[PDB]
Amino acid sequence: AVVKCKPTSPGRRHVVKVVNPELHKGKPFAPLLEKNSKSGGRNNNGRITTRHIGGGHKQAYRIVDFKRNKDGIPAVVERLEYDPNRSANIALVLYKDGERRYILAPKGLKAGDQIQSGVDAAIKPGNTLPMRNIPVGSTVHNVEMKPGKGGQLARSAGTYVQIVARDGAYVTLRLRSGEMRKVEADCRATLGEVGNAEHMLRVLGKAGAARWRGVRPTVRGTAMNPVDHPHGGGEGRNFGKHPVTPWGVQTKGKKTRSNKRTDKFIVRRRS
Amino acid sequence: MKRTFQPSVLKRNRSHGFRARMATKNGRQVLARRRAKGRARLTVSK
RNA sequence: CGCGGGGUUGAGCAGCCUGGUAGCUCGUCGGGCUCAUAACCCGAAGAUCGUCGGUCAAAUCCGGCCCCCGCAACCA
RNA sequence: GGGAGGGCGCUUACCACUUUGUGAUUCAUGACUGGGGUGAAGUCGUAACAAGGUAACCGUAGGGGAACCUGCGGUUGGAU
RNA sequence: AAUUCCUUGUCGGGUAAGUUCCGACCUGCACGAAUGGCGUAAUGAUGGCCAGGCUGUCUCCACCCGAGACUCAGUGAAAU
RNA sequence: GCUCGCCGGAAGACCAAGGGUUCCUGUCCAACGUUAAUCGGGGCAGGGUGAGUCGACCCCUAAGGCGAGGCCGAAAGGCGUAGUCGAUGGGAAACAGGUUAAUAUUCCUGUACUUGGUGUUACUGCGAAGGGGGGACGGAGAAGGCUAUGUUGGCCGGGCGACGGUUGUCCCGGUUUAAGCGUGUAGGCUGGUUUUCCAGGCAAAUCCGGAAAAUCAAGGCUGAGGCGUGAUGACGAGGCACUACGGUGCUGAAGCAACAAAUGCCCUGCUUCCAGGAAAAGCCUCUAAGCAUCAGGUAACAUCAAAUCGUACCCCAAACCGACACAGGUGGUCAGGUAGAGAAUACCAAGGCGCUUGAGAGAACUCGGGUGAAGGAACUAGGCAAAAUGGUGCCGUAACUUCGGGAGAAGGCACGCUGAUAUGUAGGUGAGGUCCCUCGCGGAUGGAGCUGAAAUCAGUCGAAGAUACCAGCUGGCUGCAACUGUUUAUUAAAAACACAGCACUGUGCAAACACGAAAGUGGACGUAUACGGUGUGACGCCUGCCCGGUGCCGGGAGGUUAAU
RNA sequence: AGGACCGAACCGACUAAUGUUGAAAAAUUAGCGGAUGACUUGUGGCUGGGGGUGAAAGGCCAAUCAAACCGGGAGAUAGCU
RNA sequence: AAAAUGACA
Ligand SMILES: [Mg+2]
Ligand SMILES: [Mg+2]
Ligand SMILES: [Mg+2]
Ligand SMILES: [Mg+2]
Ligand SMILES: [Mg+2]
Ligand SMILES: [Mg+2]
Ligand SMILES: [Mg+2]
Ligand SMILES: [Mg+2]
Ligand SMILES: [Mg+2]
Ligand SMILES: [Mg+2]
Ligand SMILES: [Mg+2]
Ligand SMILES: [Mg+2]
Ligand SMILES: [Mg+2]
Ligand SMILES: [Mg+2]
Ligand SMILES: [Mg+2]
Ligand SMILES: [Mg+2]
Ligand SMILES: [Mg+2]
Ligand SMILES: [Mg+2]
Ligand SMILES: [Mg+2]
Ligand SMILES: [Mg+2]
Ligand SMILES: [Mg+2]
Ligand SMILES: [Mg+2]
Ligand SMILES: [Mg+2]
Ligand SMILES: [Mg+2]
Ligand SMILES: [Mg+2]
Ligand SMILES: [Mg+2]
Ligand SMILES: [Mg+2]
Ligand SMILES: [Mg+2]
Ligand SMILES: [Mg+2]
Ligand SMILES: [Mg+2]
Ligand SMILES: [Mg+2]
Ligand SMILES: [Mg+2]
Ligand SMILES: [Mg+2]
Ligand SMILES: [Mg+2]
Ligand SMILES: [Mg+2]
Ligand SMILES: [Mg+2]
Ligand SMILES: [Mg+2]
Ligand SMILES: [Mg+2]
Ligand SMILES: [Mg+2]
Ligand SMILES: [Mg+2]
């Protein structure tokens, strides 16, 4: 539900929250939590490699099962939960034998639905089965790239992947970006479409709302001095240069992909 | 006014201490220079 | 008050480019279609190249004069 | 001898001139400016009346020196 | 005009007198549409102008209470 | 020694970091002390730091460092696995009184507490690098119950007033008691017990997990405070003698109740919100290999051990960082009375200080302040500086607007003291009785005493009743920036930077990009509703025309074109 | 509920005066802004010089920054004093 | 296919 806050303060005028009453408001399942340490963008050498990272709120990583390698064994959804590490809410899943795990929550999964994985599972949202068995033309998510990897496609909040064609031992996928990949037909893909579709319709509202998410301020090039950034310089907002990244590589148009090893699996590039 | 030298024994021994010199080759040539010069107290260690 | 572009039949614009060769559009004049005016058709005239001066010859080379249009006049 | 009661005076309450601070409504006035009306052979076109030479009009949007043009939906109060 | 050289442009308001301020005109040397255009309630140790209260800021200074300056005893520098 | 003045959320008392004898006696004044000094944080000599319970050491880990093998690298060397280190975090236990010139939760008195070895006895399946639980965690907010603590009354001891009264509703002081052990309350959590089964917790499992059946409406866990005991003990105002005239030596009455009450405890609780809030060990439990005599496990009894290091002194400053005995800087804990909303402010108690040159005079001139005739911004770049408003309650409040605001708009009125309402009200607290009780730290009824607003009526004093300290100046028009924030430590706090929002563009995961000769890492334990770069900067109405130039993208015919 | 309001601790530095061989190699006095947050602070870590870090001033990197400090090349060179 | 206009009296 999208809720626009009444303007009782100069800085709460443009706040649009997304609220979900179904989310469990207790505490996460303890035996599936780890320690998640922040970095601020620093690596081994201690220098920043990616900018605008640091600060925020402490978080605890939750071990989400992506492989879904439990054939048979029907399982029941216990409760939906809010996952700070991702953009899509998670669901606690209790299998019949008594083992509990975490899964991504598709949009059509309530608290009490039944799921089951394997090559014999039914065609319903929440079931996992290879795209050899998945009917052509379907909409799926959590798509794997290599058999047994775990899943790298359509994992964000509200995304989906369309199975276009099935060419022999390969399956062609239309992705959210617009690309059309070819993957091996033996990869698994959890059927449905990821939930929390209203994730766009949320404006943070204020600087502190971004700051308490580990997003430090960013400074434009034209304010910089000529030493610190190629744009730099100027007596009162002079630009006179082709836009570039701080390291000289041209932005605004220049393609920067060069792989030559996965080009065999690209049917039509994004457009 | 907060001055530059704010003492701390623990921070001093971890940085300019004897075992801080001996742990690196550059910090081991530092001692050899002091021994050749003939200094009374080698590194800092009171 | 230093440095520049320009002055061509009524108007605008080429021809000054290495010196002999003055053109395009609009316009004007006389005829023609129309009841009549525009529009259209057929024909003609229109400048000595701002002036004053200096090679067989000068709109074109050069200098002064007249006018217009530009730029620069800065560091304390 | 004085007493009761009254009067003059003092004080309190109600209240009229008067002084403030904010509005509300109405009448005049104002550099400039929007639209309207009248008026003389003014300038640019010709939108409408005939099938007015692209049928006209209605609501809406965009555009243009002006009548107006075009898109979308609607009417016949359109000639053959 | 945070942009206008001529410029204190011209007209109007406020003042006895307004190069500044507010409103209008357009003759934009050299505004103008995400190196954004035009508005905008609230906010501001932000820029400009005006009014009420208030007063030594001022006409124009006068008096008073303290710490130095001045005399006595002790210690006793610096620039050049 | 008697007066005077100052601080009193500090200029009082206790720590950590830091310092290293500055602590206490005796002695000295050459040098140090911004003067003299008989004095000192100065010289000299001597003395002083007493721990099973306080810390350190020790067990366990975070960020992170080092890193056997290992990967990579001209040499040095870089990264990293197993591990081992690393507190600012988690892990057992002691409190009162007395005592020194200097130490004391360390010495003495009294009373306790924790973990281990060995021995005796009584039972007994014990057993781990592994499994499970627990340790184990956010911000705001709201009351309820208490305590620290204070005020008053009672009791006890003392006093009868340097000057008008003061045998009384009079004045002064005291009225203290710990850790531990027992009971378990106000409250807060969960239903409990038994039987059977199994794709999970790599192995196993009586334990967690999961599925049923039957049974009972109860059990269990947590828990401030209070009440007993410790305590016929210690402490206690003062009375009694030497006075080494510094104190020592002797004895010792009362030692209760009511009310107010925290930012402290129950509270690691409860309600709610999004930005979703450490790890490991100690501890409990389960089995594997192994041993079924053992060994080991639980309980009671007795004894032994608890080693080593710090312990003085200053700690918001004369002892630390500033060259100084410097108007500067430095983290945590305690929080008395009156007026007050308050840790602001004013005066005080405990306690500590008068700041290491003084004595005179009372010129100009400078610094800090008080008051001013008439005028009231006439000063000046500019109302800079000064002056002024300033509190509670109530009436009332415009244009504009994103409907929240503007707004404390503006402008006003009442404010002390006494009495009555009411010999102190409304309210709060609640004792005697009184009834019942699953019989206890119990449930009603009950209204003695204590406490105590706010408002009206009448009167009264002053020139003035928010009287002192404290404590908004207010309106009108306008540019820029939407706003809260950040910036040139040390002449620029803004219109500059950031910001939520918008758009372009790259990026299919071994992602683009960045740090690295490389291994590797951040991106990210993320996966196009995601991530990086660029420009603009809330919101409203909008964002026109040009691809000639310089770039970017796509094209693949034709010309030119390298190494070989 | 609030990057909400008034206002102490705490943080900061807008105006004026004093001080400019200062009490102080940037402070005192009287006023001033924030004061539940993009806040503030204790302890310990990581980033190293053509590099770090930077809500961006060429700011900060031990009273020093348009390229720190120390040692070495080094008695660098000086048509200039 | 192009095909505009004409004071009043
Ligand atoms: Mg700049
Ligand atoms: Mg550059
Ligand atoms: Mg410019
Ligand atoms: Mg027509
Ligand atoms: Mg027509
Ligand atoms: Mg702008
Ligand atoms: Mg001298
Ligand atoms: Mg005092
Ligand atoms: Mg000494
Ligand atoms: Mg002396
Ligand atoms: Mg001494
Ligand atoms: Mg290493
Ligand atoms: Mg090695
Ligand atoms: Mg360790
Ligand atoms: Mg610790
Ligand atoms: Mg002592
Ligand atoms: Mg001590
Ligand atoms: Mg100094
Ligand atoms: Mg002194
Ligand atoms: Mg001091
Ligand atoms: Mg005070
Ligand atoms: Mg005087
Ligand atoms: Mg005065
Ligand atoms: Mg007087
Ligand atoms: Mg006066
Ligand atoms: Mg007067
Ligand atoms: Mg004047
Ligand atoms: Mg004046
Ligand atoms: Mg004043
Ligand atoms: Mg601003
Ligand atoms: Mg601000
Ligand atoms: Mg400043
Ligand atoms: Mg900008
Ligand atoms: Mg544009
Ligand atoms: Mg606030
Ligand atoms: Mg405030
Ligand atoms: Mg510096
Ligand atoms: Mg250099
Ligand atoms: Mg050399
Ligand atoms: Mg030399």
Swiss-Prot record, chain A:
Q: Residues bearing N6-acetyllysine?
A: K241
Where does the UniProt annotation place the signal sequence?
none
SMART domains documented for this protein: Ribosomal_L2, Ribosomal_L2_C
- Gene Ontology CC: cytoplasm; cytosol; cytosolic large ribosomal subunit; DnaA-L2 complex
Matching entries from Pfam families are given as: Ribosomal_L2 (PF00181), Ribosomal_L2_C (PF03947)
Region Disordered: which residues?
A: 27-52, 220-271
Query: Per the record's keyword annotation, is rRNA-binding included, yes or no?
Result: yes
Keywords, comma-separated and alphabetical: Acetylation, Ribonucleoprotein, Ribosomal protein, RNA-binding, rRNA-binding
GO term, biological process aspect, one: negative regulation of DNA-templated DNA replication initiation
Compositional bias ranges of the Low complexity kind: 38-47
One further remark on this entry is: This protein can be partially replaced in vivo by its H.marismortui (HmaL2) or human (L8, from the 60S cytoplasmic ribosome) homolog.
Q: Which family does it belong to?
A: Belongs to the universal ribosomal protein uL2 family.
Kindly state the subunit structure of this protein.
Answer: Part of the 50S ribosomal subunit. Forms a bridge to the 30S subunit in the 70S ribosome, contacting the 16S rRNA. Interacts weakly with S6 in one of the 3.5 A resolved structures. In pull-down experiments interacts with CedA.
**What is this protein's function?**
One of the primary rRNA binding proteins. Located near the base of the L1 stalk, it is probably also mobile. Required for association of the 30S and 50S subunits to form the 70S ribosome, for tRNA binding and peptide bond formation. It has been suggested to have peptidyltransferase activity; this is highly controversial. In the E.coli 70S ribosome in the initiation state it has been modeled to make several contacts with the 16S rRNA (forming bridge B7b, PubMed:12809609); these contacts are broken in the model with bound EF-G.
Q: What is this protein called?
A: Large ribosomal subunit protein uL2
Curated annotation (Swiss-Prot), chain B:
Q: Which GO terms describe its cellular component?
A: ribonucleoprotein complex; ribosome
One GO biological process from the UniProt record? translation
Instruction: Enumerate the PROSITE patterns for this protein.
Output: RIBOSOMAL_L34
Keyword match DNA repair: no
Q: Which keywords belong to this entry?
A: Ribonucleoprotein, Ribosomal protein
* Molecular function terms from GO: structural constituent of ribosome
Query: Pfam families this protein is in?
Result: Ribosomal_L34 (PF00468)
Q: Which InterPro entries match?
A: Ribosomal_bL34 (IPR000271), Ribosomal_bL34_CS (IPR020939)
- Which Cys-Cys disulfides exist here? none
Among HAMAP family, the record links this protein to: Ribosomal_bL34 (MF_00391)
Q: What does the sequence similarity comment in the record state about its family?
A: Belongs to the bacterial ribosomal protein bL34 family.
Q: What is this protein called?
A: Large ribosomal subunit protein bL34
User: What is the organism field in this record?
Assistant: Escherichia coli O45:K1 (strain S88 / ExPEC)
